[PDB]
Amino acid sequence: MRVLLIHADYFEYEVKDKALKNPEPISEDMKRGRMEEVLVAFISVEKVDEKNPEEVSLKAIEEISKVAEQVKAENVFVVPWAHLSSELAKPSVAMDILNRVYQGLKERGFNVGKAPFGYYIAVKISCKGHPLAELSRTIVPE
């Protein structure tokens, strides 16, 4: 797994076309979402994570939680994202891990949003630019 974490004043998205023939189904209401004062977690789930969905999920929850605690963000947003890796996992595995990370951050006590899997999405973001506002993490099976 590769993750990029961006502490943002706001994050807004609007789903455009479908990228997979069969993407994640959504209410007209989940086509557009927005949060303020939000740690956005762009997650590329990789091939090597199929080995172990739960270790990798727990690791990611932890690593995202610490940074969230450290930057004083109560709001977290999980985003499926192809662009930190080139050896990516098949969608069931990615869907799986992303849902586990989402659920685990709700259980830690954050107000969590996520993005629908398998669309092209239009995005607006304002990135804070203090020292800890943009971080990369690599997470692997030990």
Among candidate residues 140, 128, 139, the one with its CA nearest the CA of residue 6:
128
List strand residue ranges (DSSP E) for the chain, in order: 2-18, 32-44, 75-80, 111-114, 119-127, 134-138
Angle CA(84)–CA(55)–CA(110) in degrees, nearest 5? 75
Q: Helix (H, G, I), strand (E, B), or coil: what is residue 16?
A: strand
Spatial distance between the Cα atoms of 104 and 102, rounded to a whole number of angstroms: 6
Take residue 138 and report the two structure tokens written for it.
């690599």
Which listed CATH number (3.10.520.10, 2.40.30.20, 1.20.1050.90, 3.50.80.10) goes with 1-139?
Answer: 3.50.80.10
**Per-residue three-class SS string for 45-72:** CEHHHCCCHHHHHHHHHHHHHHHHHHHC
Structure resolution, Å: 2.5
Elucidated via: X-ray
Spatial distance between the Cα atoms of 11 and 38, rounded to a whole number of angstroms: 7
Which residues share a beta bridge with 59? none
Q: Domain-by-domain residue ranges, the chain? A: 1-139
